[PDB]
Design a protein around this motif. Structure first.
Motif, mmCIF file in Angstrom:
data_model
loop_
_atom_site.group_PDB
_atom_site.id
_atom_site.type_symbol
_atom_site.label_atom_id
_atom_site.label_comp_id
_atom_site.label_asym_id
_atom_site.label_seq_id
_atom_site.Cartn_x
_atom_site.Cartn_y
_atom_site.Cartn_z
ATOM 1 N N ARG B 13 -33.067 80.064 55.854
ATOM 2 C CA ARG B 13 -32.340 80.586 54.700
ATOM 3 C C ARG B 13 -32.522 82.100 54.713
ATOM 4 N NH1 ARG B 13 -35.438 76.718 51.549
ATOM 5 N NH2 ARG B 13 -34.552 74.616 51.797
ATOM 6 N N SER B 15 -31.642 85.812 53.790
ATOM 7 C CA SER B 15 -31.048 86.624 52.742
ATOM 8 C C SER B 15 -30.774 88.026 53.281
ATOM 9 C CB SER B 15 -31.963 86.657 51.516
ATOM 10 O OG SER B 15 -31.787 85.506 50.709
ATOM 11 N N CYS B 16 -30.364 88.923 52.388
ATOM 12 C CA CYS B 16 -30.181 90.325 52.727
ATOM 13 C C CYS B 16 -30.798 91.194 51.641
ATOM 14 C CB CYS B 16 -28.701 90.676 52.933
ATOM 15 S SG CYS B 16 -27.588 90.252 51.577
ATOM 16 N N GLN B 19 -29.223 93.406 46.577
ATOM 17 C CA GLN B 19 -29.165 92.398 45.532
ATOM 18 C C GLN B 19 -27.805 92.416 44.844
ATOM 19 O OE1 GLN B 19 -30.779 89.416 45.023
ATOM 20 N NE2 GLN B 19 -31.336 90.004 42.930
ATOM 21 N N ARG B 66 -29.289 84.293 44.239
ATOM 22 C CA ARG B 66 -29.350 85.223 45.353
ATOM 23 C C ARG B 66 -28.278 84.898 46.389
ATOM 24 N NH1 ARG B 66 -34.608 87.264 48.015
ATOM 25 N NH2 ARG B 66 -33.014 88.844 48.483
ATOM 26 N N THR B 68 -27.572 84.324 50.135
ATOM 27 C CA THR B 68 -28.307 83.921 51.323
ATOM 28 C C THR B 68 -27.361 83.211 52.282
ATOM 29 O OG1 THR B 68 -30.312 82.815 52.119
ATOM 30 C CG2 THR B 68 -29.020 81.682 50.415
ATOM 31 N N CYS B 84 -25.029 91.399 56.314
ATOM 32 C CA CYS B 84 -24.720 91.028 54.934
ATOM 33 C C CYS B 84 -23.819 92.110 54.346
ATOM 34 C CB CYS B 84 -25.996 90.854 54.113
ATOM 35 S SG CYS B 84 -25.748 90.192 52.444
#
Ligand SMILES: *[C@@H]1O[C@H](CO)[C@@H](O[C@@H]2O[C@H](CO)[C@@H](O[C@@H]3O[C@H](CO[C@H]4O[C@H](CO[C@H]5O[C@H](CO)[C@@H](O)[C@H](O)[C@@H]5O)[C@@H](O)[C@H](O[C@H]5O[C@H](CO)[C@@H](O)[C@H](O)[C@@H]5O)[C@@H]4O)[C@@H](O)[C@H](O[C@H]4O[C@H](CO)[C@@H](O)[C@H](O)[C@@H]4O[C@H]4O[C@H](CO)[C@@H](O)[C@H](O)[C@@H]4O[C@H]4O[C@H](CO)[C@@H](O)[C@H](O)[C@@H]4O)[C@@H]3O)[C@H](O)[C@H]2NC(C)=O)[C@H](O)[C@H]1NC(C)=O
Ligand SMILES: *[C@@H]1O[C@H](CO)[C@@H](O)[C@H](O)[C@H]1NC(C)=O
Lengths: 133, 107
Positions: B13, B15-16, B19, B66, B68, B84
């Motif tokens: 998983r 994310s970047c 935000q 979030r 992801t 991202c």
């Protein structure tokens, strides 16, 4: 389906014009956006600028409008010229097509929406560099 | 570059760093080193023609979640760079692709 093929000179000196042609076949340029993405070896991807059907000459902040992306609908290609290049601008340049889809979160009558771009069909890219000879 | 080490046969998983500043529309890109980049996920849930049911995203309903990228059962051929391209609503035009995240597969 569109097919994107690119070709350039390959070797440049500083203070020159790096003109790389990206030709398309199959479909025309009626509802297909056009852009160029650069990436230095050791660095990440960098969107330098895009063009649209309304001749949108908008470019990346790092680029600071020193580059021109031209869209000629006669001979069906996409040219990107780089006047006054630097020796620290060695990169591999990819050309892709975009889609101006809008994300609406509020109402459209007030302007509570933004346009996001999806680079769906890409190109393999040419590897240009700045050498001594 | 934020390397994520995940072994074979295990999910990831990723994310970047940027935000969600409101309503988002991210575009995940898979850049093989030297080859052509490809699209993974556009509009946070839509899969384009050419991506099977392994790369899935998170929807934007009830903001606070979030952004992801879930890869269920990553194969050996997914050794590339992940981007991202975050498009939020309150930060304007995002010309930058963000941090180039290099996924490292162990084993
Ligand atoms: C006073 O009057 C004014 C004016 O009349 C009222 O103002 C309205 O206010 C609302 C609320 O802000 C606005 O709603 C937004 O609407 C957009 C619309 O996009 C979708 O809807 C179109 C038609 O909708 C109709 O049909 C669908 C079924 O098809 C039905 O579900 C729906 O209820 C409605 O009946 C579609 O045609 C459209 O497709 C188009 O757009 C695509 C790209 O978006 C494009 O690819 C297509 O080709 C096509 O062109 C699209 O489906 C909503 O998108 C938006 O809601 C999103 O955002 C909020 C906040 O972030 C979030 O909570 C929502 O859940 C939703 O987020 C989803 O969509 C995102 C992008 O689409 C996606 O990234 C997210 O992950 C998330 O996806 C989830 O849901 C989708 C299904 O939608 C699902 O597939 C996913 O798997 C996932 O589960 C807003 O709600 C109105 O626009 C606005 N009216 C006007 C005229 O501007 C005001 O409310 C009035 N006030 C009072 C008090 O009455
Ligand atoms: C707004 O607040 C209410 C309760 O305070 C909560 O239920 C709702 O999910 C919130 N919505 C957003 C978009 O933050």
């Amino acid at each position: 389906q569109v097919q994107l093929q690119e070709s350039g000179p390959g070797l440049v000196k500083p203070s020159e014009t790096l003109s790389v042609t990206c030709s398309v076949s199959g479909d025309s340029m009626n509802n297909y956006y056009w852009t160029w993405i650069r990436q230095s070896p050791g660095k990440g991807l960098e969107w330098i600028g895009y063009i649209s059907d309304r001749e949108s000459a908008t470019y990346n902040p790092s680029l600071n409008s020193r580059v021109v992306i031209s869209r000629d609908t006669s001979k069906n290609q996409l040219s990107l010229k780089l006047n006054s290049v630097t020796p620290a601008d060695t990169a591999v340049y990819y050309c892709a097509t975009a889609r101006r889809g809008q994300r609406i979160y509020g109402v459209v009558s007030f302007g509570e929406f933004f346009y996001y771009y999806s680079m769906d069909v890409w190109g393999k890219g040419t590897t240009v560099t700045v050498s001594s000879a | 570059v934020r390397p994520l080490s995940v072994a074979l046969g295990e999910t990831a998983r990723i994310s970047c760093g940027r935000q969600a500043l409101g309503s988002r529309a991210v575009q995940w890109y898979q850049h093989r080193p030297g080859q052509a980049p490809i699209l993974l996920i556009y509009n946070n849930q839509d899969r384009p023609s050419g991506i099977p049911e392994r790369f899935s995203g998170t929807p934007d309903i009830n903001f606070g979640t979030r952004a992801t990228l879930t890869i269920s059962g990553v194969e050996a051929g997914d050794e590339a760079d992940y981007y991202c391209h975050m498009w939020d609503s309150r930060s304007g035009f995002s010309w930058s692709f963000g941090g180039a995240t290099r996924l490292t597969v162990l084993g």
